[PDB]
Design a protein around this ligand. Structure first.
Ligand SMILES: Cc1nc(N(C)C(=O)Cc2ccc(-c3cc(F)ccc3F)cc2)sc1[S@@](C)(N)O
Ligand SMILES: [Zn+2]
Lengths: 766, 459, 746
DNA sequence: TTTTTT
């Protein structure tokens, strides 16, 4: 009663067959039981073992009981001799699509056609290429062919049939192990892949990082799990030489044993703060105890009486030209005694340097020449004022009427106390409290405090630019801000380990401005720490940003609204970059406080009347009897993604020199640049004949000097493109094959070309 | 041999979703009756047309040009019941080539042939009647009625002519490079499906099954354009349109009815990009990431002068892309150097057709002097072409001529992504260093899709 | 029948330098003697000399100079209104001129000696000094003095200074000012000059807004100080009777000016005005207006001085600061004047011998030596040190160490070799300049004023005659050889030094001190006696008997470079550090930090494996660096403290165009330029010449990220030497300034 | 500017 499923192609030629007998046990069959039954079925000597034979999206009948019929069936099944019409009647594509190998031609044709759907299992849903790959890793011992007939020496079906029937991958252990090995390999592979995809999907769903970080992450993680070496070792592990399952040579796979050791090992690093700080930030602090702490404070923080209420302003407030001239006039009274001559970036740099300069004893400070008072005490804040229609009016002040600016949002102690009695809460109470809320003339309309790298930063001021899918309710925003407070305080207690930040009493301050919910979050730097450096606060911002997208409450609250999960901008901390102060507008939205009371705040009225003190929202404010002071002056430099650092490590390990080293090939600033200019002169005549005789006699002069970008202005320059004022430049970077990327660039001072933007014209090899 | 592994083991969840999407029986009342398509024939203008829902399902397969989505289509064909179609004849033949390279695939035709598009429909007024959608929120019935009013001059003719097709034997319709089809077609296909299963009373119609449209294509490397010709001004205009992919991804009504969250597969990896840098450029381009200084310096190494690309003596054997058909007509010429009908129609007009007289591509990109690829079933040089046509087929060596001011970063991404290797790529200017109109709306939608637990990413 | 008087000569100045008729190669020079008799009464006297061309070319060292050139220079200097500041053209010319006129004065007339009794004669028929003889009777009057303060605002145009500094880059800015007055003498006519000469009899003060104009404030009179004397003379050069006006300095003798803010232009202008005022009336000869000083040369000079080569004939001594011991330096200047006849430090090395007679004396001294030293002189290459010393990375202790020095060995050896070549000199009477050097050497231990003279006369003499260096360093090499030979006998072991100064160890048990003094004294005795015996055998005889100085006993000694040595006696905690550059006020604090860190790190002799000690030493060195940079912050605004003294030889920062506006402050710059590197704006570090701007200074914050790096560099040099010298080598102590504690300043 | 369906 042995049942055979046979594929034929015209006397009948049978070239693939699956023999099976109905299992008399309910659930008796095991893998080794099936292997024994199959090895018994396919006779090792040749043919089958039964007495009577019934021979018959799906990929694809005669009885045999008399002696002649069964003899003919054995002859046609073990050798390949065609079955004549009498026996039945009384009762290149294949070589192409089923592998060139004999193993494939027999075993894969048997499985994919006559064995896949009948036996069920996962292999029923796998394609021909997948099944051929599985056959390729089914690397059972290979004995030589007795007739040495090659698999490609086959023309008709009388050859393919003879090859398959007299093969030793067809009538024994291999023919019995292949169906079981398909199931085993798939099971082992899915065990590892499904685990890796569980990790992938979870980390993807809870990442809450910037758009650019996400891309690197998905790609790199997919590479670790699926990469040439990882996939190769995994398939080598599943490789079996013994078809017998008991002694199969397949062991657990190295994949899912190296990723969980390499990157997925630290996939749970960005997944949890405490591991994001340990592995991504390198803290560099320097303790300073004694009079040196007091010294460092005054030297690197706004003077005590500079952010304290004063009746009228006192400082230099003027437009760009009027302050450019006044700065030069001040230098004319400053040069006689030491200040070198400086023969809108230069003005801001000079003003910041003037403000930073400290007082030497009772002598009036250096900025007193510009501010024109002897009561001025440095260091000082420097602000930028945008006016109408335009004009960046820089203003350096020694004191200002901040009481007047914050008067509108100042709530009397009686009011706050009465609201506290009406609403004894911290979430519903802040709700009620918030609901209850010429260069000289423009000073009190628009200010933008300008970062001074010389001074020490005392407040973590984060600019939260929230993007919105649709309008939001205030209560959801206030709850999200409470969650943000929680996450930021966890991140702060992680960054500053010797501080004491109780995340129910530590005051965080919040200010809010169809487009965006403009937010500003101000945090006191906990004592005894002071943060120094633009890059250090950049790192603090990255830690806070990747810590707030870890708290499930924040993402659950605001997640359905934020189109891009990036909230914190980290580019407002460079030297000379301005940030819009709270209690100020933009020339369209006056930043006003939104009160998120600490859950265990012991002084609510103080917290409310703490948002009106300028010190709470100034980068280099005076810190509010210091014994010890710890200056976090580095939290690690360039914050190469904790991922792309591995993508920088994997960049070479898989793909494969800096500009300076490449310059070594050319024996290496203006000298070699003029040699490259000689090559440019020859080609510029042909490429642009209208200005051919212009750059023939120009001199290279380095204007921009970067590690991988040396730009040299070609001071003698009519624009080559959009021929009509323009400046020509010579770029220097890395070429295609680690060469010299020398580019001709014609920045144009006209409207047609992007004004003051650098453009490229041709890049030639060197 | 390990290259296929990720696809092999990640297409299985896709296969284990399309099956239930295709074996879901509809309620008896929701099945579009024959009388519906009888009334549609009776209707003359697409105004009194009744609001009628035509149920359908989708499964979206998206990714880069060489992402390997073709492996997903291959696995689908050999395992599932399916009618594989294509948005263009070239794409249909490309799929046939890649499906017959593994097993048997029946002759793959275009979706247009499948729903009965014939010769007279080619030049048909496909944008005439108006529609004020009683919407916001837009009901699916209103969207389908808009897409039927859009194609009234095609839907009506198909219904009238109908009142054996391959739509009678399967409910899984794979449309490859479906971004080359406009949104009007999506509803149309579903509509036509029900037609061909109602007149013939197919066993699927008795089983109350509904169409599932497996749309495979690149959403940020492909666009669909609609051309209308004004018959007095003789000004043929071509506006941009919403493709099927963008319609499905960006419409809140379709993203809910079709449940794109549980029905979306993004193929994420290229397999011909041997340049960390070329790959990184393609990544910044297909995702909308901020353009940094480093990217500008990288693409700086490709810029070669305007008079270097256009000169035929340079870059021999390099395909040159322009952003204007007149520009190609100029460059090809330079390279070579190196009664009753018009009586009655004039009567009816109350008072450029060379392009609208044959295959547009070669008709407006020819100087006929030759020096090639067959266009129709009409030869093209394959040496110079437009960026918009370049979307269809990949190229070996590419020199891009960019017109300033008309710079669209999607055009730059399409032009730069036609070649496998960044080594063989030259350009007029730097698209990253010049003013470019970037439209990063579908980019954030893919990004939010890459940020969803129910979307299947295949590496 | 010659007149005879009794007087002491207080000064000798140059009045006239003329070329007589029928003369081609010999010029006569008239010398003004400011003689004073007993009880101070002063009578002016005059003498004549006759210098030949050969003598001029000998005292110049080259034949480029000629008699015509000297006479032209003297004629130009005759008038100060037309052209003052004559020496600035060829300072060597006037230097040699004074040298030869003094030599001829010594030769023809006889032996002269300032502030000393001298019998003087005169010939009435002609009316000049004829012969000077040393007398031996009289308690001569004390060399009285007068305190002079003079300040002038000579409105020099800055751009001229900038241009003249551009022609010669490393031109000391006092030379720039002085050249500006020389090229525009009218600038010396308009200046707010104020003068106050206080004497013991009567004070005199004048104030001017314009120099030529009458005073806007008077006090006393010109006549109280000066007794204008008209004296008739009949020189052999001038047959006709020639009358000379001289400014006899009644009441006082020499001037005493504070060197703190001394302005050579100020005194030049005041003396030019006096010259114009006195010699305005004709009928008499005009004197020479010549002055020399370190401000008169492009590259400057070490020791402040103001020579008076002519008018008014009164020596003026600049005594720089030193308020605590002002009388001591005034006496030192007076002694230096009296001994070296006032040529020092203006004439230079020619006080001893002509610059060109030295090539003969050195050769004549290479012959009288012993045969071995004869070759030893000829094989001397710069810094040979042919003696068994220690490897520069090395340290010793605990063993009884000791430093020794021969006080003034180069000067004494030069004197002995000069006597060896004395027989080879052309003129036995031309050896009087060889009597001043012996007077200096003999009086060197008794009085320190001879010291500073000998520490500059000798190195400059060695530059006048390059061949004398190979002789002096060969004689000293021979001395070191016998030092090493005798050392073994007395348990001494040569371990390092530089010749005259040498430090070594003792092979005595390192715990006993009662017998330590005995061996340390016997070694000194034996080494001194043996070196004296070698010198005597080498024929070289020293005027002052040789003496060895025990400059300290120490137990530990560590050396890193060839000059850097630190010694420490644990018992009394007395230490000594050498080789650390004191290039400013911060380097002294660095030296103190180093001498405390080394005292603490060699106190770690507690029994430990050598590996442990290296780490517990490096930790302490890093901690010392930390405590230094912490204290550096509390003085970040003291730019003068963070200042470096650049020499006119070293590469220097470029002068800002506003430092050329210091007024009466550019004159103070003679040798050193004190520069502080400040950081204006960002990125750029610019140098500020501190002493060329008025005080209090206003500056951008001082770039301590540059000065502290160099101070730390030399600290790590010392610390790497000690770390790799006491314990196992292989450790270059580096302090991560750029990371650990860079934030404080940058 | 702008392809594509028979
Ligand atoms: C070292 C490394 N190597 C990696 N691999 C194999 C790739 O980047 C391969 C590739 C290259 C081009 C495309 C691509 C193509 C497009 F048409 C559009 C967008 C695209 F991204 C996708 C994949 S990934 C990494 S990492 C930095 N993730 O560690
Ligand atoms: Zn331009």
């Amino acid at each position: 009663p042995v049942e055979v499923t046979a594929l034929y192609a015209t006397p009948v030629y049978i070239f693939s067959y699956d023999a099976y007998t109905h299992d008399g046990r309910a659930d008796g069959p095991t893998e080794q039981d099936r292997f024994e039954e199959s090895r018994a079925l396919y006779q090792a000597s040749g043919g089958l073992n039964g007495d009577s034979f019934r021979v018959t999206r799906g990929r694809t009948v005669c009885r045999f009981e008399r002696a002649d019929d069964v003899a003919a069936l054995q002859d046609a099944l073990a050798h390949g001799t065609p079955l004549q019409p009498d026996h039945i009647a009384a009762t290149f594509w294949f070589l192409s699509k089923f592998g060139p190998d004999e193993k494939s031609l027999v075993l894969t044709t048997r499985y994919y056609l006559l064995q896949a759907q009948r036996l069920g299992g996962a292999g029923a849903t796998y394609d021909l290429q997948a099944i051929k790959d599985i056959c390729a890793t089914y690397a059972i011992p290979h004995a030589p062919r007795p007739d040495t007939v090659s698999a490609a020496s086959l023309t008709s079906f009388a050859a393919i049939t003879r090859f398959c029937c007299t093969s030793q991958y067809a009538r024994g252990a291999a023919a019995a192990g292949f169906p079981l090995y398909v199931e085993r390999r798939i099971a082992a592979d899915v065990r590892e892949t499904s685990a890796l995809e569980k990790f992938i999907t979870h980390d993807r769903s809870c990442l809450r990082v910037s758009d650019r970080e996400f891309i690197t992450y998905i790609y790199l993680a997919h590479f670790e799990c699926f990469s040439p070496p990882r996939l190769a070792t995994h398939l080598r592990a599943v490789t079996t030489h013994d078809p017998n399952p008991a002694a199969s040579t397949e062991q657990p796979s190295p994949l899912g044993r190296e990723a969980v050791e390499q990157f997925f090992c630290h996939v749970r690093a960005q997944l949890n703060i405490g591991e994001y700080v340990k592995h991504n930030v390198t803290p560099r602090e320097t303790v300073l105890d004694g009079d040196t702490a007091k010294a460092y404070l005054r030297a690197r923080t706004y003077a005590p009486g500079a952010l304290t209420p004063a009746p009228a302003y006192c400082g230099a407030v003027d437009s760009a030209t009027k302050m450019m001239g006044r700065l030069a006039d001040a230098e004319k009274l400053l040069v006689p005694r030491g200040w070198p001559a400086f023969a809108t970036c230069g003005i801001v740099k000079r003003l910041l340097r003037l403000a930073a300069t400290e007082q030497q004893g009772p002598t009036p400070p250096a900025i007193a020449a510009l501010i024109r008072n002897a009561a001025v005490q440095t260091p000082l804040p420097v602000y930028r004022i945008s006016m109408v229609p335009t004009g960046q009016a820089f203003a350096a002040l020694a004191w200002d009427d901040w009481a007047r600016i914050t008067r509108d949002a100042r709530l009397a102690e009686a009011v706050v106390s009465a609201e506290a009695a009406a609403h004894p809460d911290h979430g519903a109470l802040g709700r009620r409290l918030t609901d209850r809320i010429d260069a000289g003339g423009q000073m009190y309309v628009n200010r933008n405090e300008i970062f001074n790298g010389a001074l020490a930063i005392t407040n973590i001021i984060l600019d939260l630019d929230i993007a919105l899918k649709e309008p939001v309710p205030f209560r959801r925003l206030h709850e999200a801000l409470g969650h943000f407070r929680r996450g930021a305080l966890a991140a702060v207690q992680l960054l500053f380990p010797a501080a004491r930040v109780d995340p129910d009493a530590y005051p965080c301050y919040f200010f809010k401005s169809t487009d965006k919910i403009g937010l500003r979050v101000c945090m006191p730097v906990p004592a005894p720490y002071v943060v120094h450096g633009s890059l250090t606060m950049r790192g603090v911002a990255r830690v806070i940003q990747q810590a707030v997208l870890l708290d499930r409450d924040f993402v659950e609250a605001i997640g359905s609204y934020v189109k891009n999960f990036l909230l914190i901008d980290t580019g407002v901390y460079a030297h000379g970059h301005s940030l819009r102060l709270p209690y100020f507008a933009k020339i369209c939205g006056r930043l006003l406080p939104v009160f998120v009371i600490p859950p265990a705040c012991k002084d609510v009225p103080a917290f409310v009347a703490a948002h009106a003190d300028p010190r709470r929202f100034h980068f280099h404010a005076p810190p509010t009897s210091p014994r010890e002071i710890r200056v976090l002056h580095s939290l690690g430099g360039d914050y190469v993604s904790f991922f792309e650092r591995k993508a920088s490590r994997n960049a070479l390990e898989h793909f494969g020199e800096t500009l300076t080293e490449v310059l070594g090939r050319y024996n290496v600033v203006e000298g070699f640049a003029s040699e490259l200019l000689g090559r440019i002169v020859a080609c510029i005549e042909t490429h642009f004949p209208e200005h051919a005789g212009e750059y023939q006699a120009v001199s290279v002069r380095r204007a921009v000097s970067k590690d991988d970008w040396v730009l040299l202005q070609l001071v003698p320059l009519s624009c080559l493109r959009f021929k009509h004022t323009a400046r020509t430049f010579v770029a220097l970077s890395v070429g295609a094959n680690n060469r010299l990327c020398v580019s001709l660039c014609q920045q144009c001072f006209a409207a047609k070309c992007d004004s003051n933007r650098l453009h490229t014209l041709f890049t030639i090899d060197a | 041999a390990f290259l296929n592994f990720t696809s092999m083991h990640g297409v299985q969840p896709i296969l284990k979703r399309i099956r239930e999407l295709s074996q879901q029986q509809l309620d008896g009342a929701q099945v579009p009756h024959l009388q519906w398509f009888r009334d549609v024939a009776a209707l003359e203008s697409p105004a009194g047309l009744p609001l009628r829902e035509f149920p359908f399902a989708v499964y979206l397969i998206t990714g880069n040009a060489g992402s390997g989505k073709s492996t997903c289509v291959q696995t689908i064909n050999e395992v599932l019941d399916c009618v594989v179609t294509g948005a263009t004849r070239i794409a249909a033949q490309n799929m046939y080539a890649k499906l017959s390279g593994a097993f048997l695939s029946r002759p793959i035709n275009t979706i247009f042939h499948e729903f009965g598009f014939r010769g007279n429909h080619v030049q048909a007024q496909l944008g005439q009647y108006p529609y004020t959608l009683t919407s916001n929120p837009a009901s699916l019935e209103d969207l389908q009625r808009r897409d039927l009013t859009y194609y009234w001059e095609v839907i009506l003719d198909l219904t009238k002519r109908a009142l054996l097709p391959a739509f009678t034997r399967s409910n899984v319709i794979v449309i490859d490079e479906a971004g080359l089809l406009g949104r009007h077609l999506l509803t149309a296909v579903v509509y036509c499906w029900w037609m061909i299963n109602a007149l013939y009373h197919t066993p699927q119609y008795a089983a109350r099954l509904r169409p599932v449209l497996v749309c495979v294509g690149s959403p940020t490397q492909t666009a669909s354009l609609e051309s209308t010709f004004e018959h007095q001004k003789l000004r043929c205009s071509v506006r941009q349109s919403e493709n099927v992919l963008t319609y499905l991804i960006c419409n809140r009504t379709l993203r809910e009815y079709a449940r794109l969250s549980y029905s979306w597969a993004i193929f994420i990896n290229n397999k011909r990009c041997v340049e960390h840098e070329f790959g990184n450029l393609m990544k910044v381009l297909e995702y909308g990431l901020p353009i940094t200084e480093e990217h500008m310096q990288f693409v700086d190494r490709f810029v070669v002068p305007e008079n270097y690309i256009t000169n035929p003596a340079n870059l021999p054997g390099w395909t040159r892309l322009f952003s204007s058909h007149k520009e190609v007509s100029a460059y090809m010429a330079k390279l070579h150097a190196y009664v009753k009908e018009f009586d009655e129609y004039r009567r009816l007009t109350h008072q450029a057709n060379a392009s609208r007289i044959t295959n547009y591509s070669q008709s407006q990109d020819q100087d006929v002097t030759y020096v090639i690829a067959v266009t129709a079933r009409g030869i093209s040089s394959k040496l110079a072409m437009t960026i918009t046509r370049s979307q269809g087929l990949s190229l070996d060596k590419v020199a891009i001529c960019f017109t300033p001011g008309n710079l669209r970063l999607n055009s730059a991404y399409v032009a730069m992504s036609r070649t496998t290797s960044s080594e063989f790529l030259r350009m007029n200017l730097n698209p990253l260093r010049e003013r470019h109109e970037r439209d990063d709306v579908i980019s954030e939608h893919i990004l939010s899709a890459l940020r969803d637990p129910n979307v299947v990413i295949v590496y | 029948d010659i007149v005879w008087v009794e007087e002491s000569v207080s000064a000798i100045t140059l009045y006239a330098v003329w070329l007589p008729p029928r003369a081609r190669e010999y010029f006569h020079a008239l010398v003004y003697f400011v003689c004073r008799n007993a009880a101070g009464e002063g009578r002016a006297r005059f003498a004549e000399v006759s210098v030949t061309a050969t003598e001029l070319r000998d005292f110049y060292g080259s034949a480029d100079v000629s008699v015509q050139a000297v006479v032209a220079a003297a004629r130009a200097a005759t008038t100060p209104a037309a052209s003052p500041l004559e020496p600035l053209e060829n300072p060597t010319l006037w230097r040699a001129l004074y040298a030869c006129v003094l030599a001829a004065l010594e030769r023809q007339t006889g032996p002269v000696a300032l502030f000393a009794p001298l019998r003087i004669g005169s010939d009435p028929r002609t009316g000049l000094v004829v012969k000077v003889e040393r007398a031996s009777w009289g308690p001569p009057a004390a060399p009285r003095a007068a305190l002079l303060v003079a300040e002038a605002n000579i409105d020099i145009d800055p751009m001229a200074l900038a241009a003249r500094v551009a022609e010669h880059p490393d031109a000391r800015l006092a030379w720039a000012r002085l050249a500006a007055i020389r090229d525009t003498p009218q600038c010396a006519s308009a200046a707010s000059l104020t003068v106050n000469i206080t004497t013991g009899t009567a004070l005199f003060a004048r104030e001017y807004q314009t120099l030529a104009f009458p005073p806007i404030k008077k006090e006393g009179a010109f006549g109280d100080l000066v007794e204008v004397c008209e004296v008739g003379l009949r020189p052999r050069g001038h047959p006709q009777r020639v009358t000379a006006r001289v400014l006899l300095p009644r009441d006082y003798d020499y001037f005493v000016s504070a060197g703190e803010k001394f302005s050579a232009p100020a005194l030049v202008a005041l003396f030019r005005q006096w010259h114009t005022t006195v010699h305005a009336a004709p009928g008499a000869l005009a004197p020479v207006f010549a002055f020399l000083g370190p401000e008169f040369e492009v590259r400057g000079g070490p020791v402040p001085y103001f020579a008076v080569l002519g008018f008014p004939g009164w020596p003026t001594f600049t005594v720089p600061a030193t308020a605590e011991s002002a009388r001591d330096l005034v006496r030192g200047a007076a002694a230096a004047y009296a001994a070296l006849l006032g040529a020092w430090p203006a004439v230079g090395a020619r006080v001893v011998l002509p610059p060109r007679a030295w090539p003969g004396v050195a050769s004549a001294a290479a012959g009288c030596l012993l045969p071995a030293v004869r070759e030893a002189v000829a094989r001397w290459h710069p810094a040979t040190k042919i003696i068994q010393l220690l490897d520069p990375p090395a340290a010793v202790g605990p063993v009884w160490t000791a430093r020794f020095c021969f006080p003034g060995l180069r000067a004494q050896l030069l004197a002995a070799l000069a006597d060896l070549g004395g027989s080879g000199l052309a003129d036995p009477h031309g050896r009087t300049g060889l009597a001043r050097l012996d007077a200096l050497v003999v009086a060197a231990p008794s009085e320190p004023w001879a010291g500073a003279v000998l520490e500059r006369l000798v190195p400059d003499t060695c530059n006048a005659c390059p061949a004398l260096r190979q002789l002096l360093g060969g004689v000293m090499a021979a001395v070191c050889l016998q030092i090493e030979e005798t050392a073994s006998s007395v348990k001494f072991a040569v371990c390092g030094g530089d010749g005259g100064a040498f430090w070594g160890v003792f092979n005595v048990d390192p715990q006993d001190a009662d017998a330590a003094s005995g061996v340390i004294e016997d070694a000194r005795r034996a080494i001194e006696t043996a070196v004296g015996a070698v010198l005597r055998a080498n024929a070289v005889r020293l005027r002052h008997p040789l003496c060895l100085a025990l400059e300290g006993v120490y137990t530990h000694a560590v050396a890193w470079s060839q000059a850097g040595v630190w010694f420490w006696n644990s018992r009394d905690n007395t230490d000594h550090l050498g080789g650390f550059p004191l290039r400013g006020p911060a380097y002294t604090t660095a030296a103190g930090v180093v001498r405390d860190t080394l005292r603490r790190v060699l106190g770690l002799t507690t029994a430990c494996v050598p590996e442990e000690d290296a780490l517990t030493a490096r930790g302490l060195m890093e901690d010392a660096c930390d405590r230094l940079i912490l204290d550096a912050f509390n003085k970040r605004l003291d730019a003068e403290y963070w200042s470096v003294r650049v020499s006119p030889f070293e590469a220097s920062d470029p002068l800002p165009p506003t430092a050329f506006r210091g007024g009466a402050l550019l004159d103070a710059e003679h040798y050193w330029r004190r520069v502080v590197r400040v950081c204006p704006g960002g990125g750029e570090s610019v140098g500020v010449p501190v002493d060329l701007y008025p005080r209090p200074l206003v500056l951008p914050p001082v770039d301590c990220a540059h000065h502290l790096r160099e101070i730390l560099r030399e600290i790590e040099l010392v610390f790497t030497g000690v770390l790799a010298g006491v314990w196992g080598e292989g450790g270059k102590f580096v302090y991560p300034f750029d990371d650990k504690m860079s934030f404080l300043f940058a």
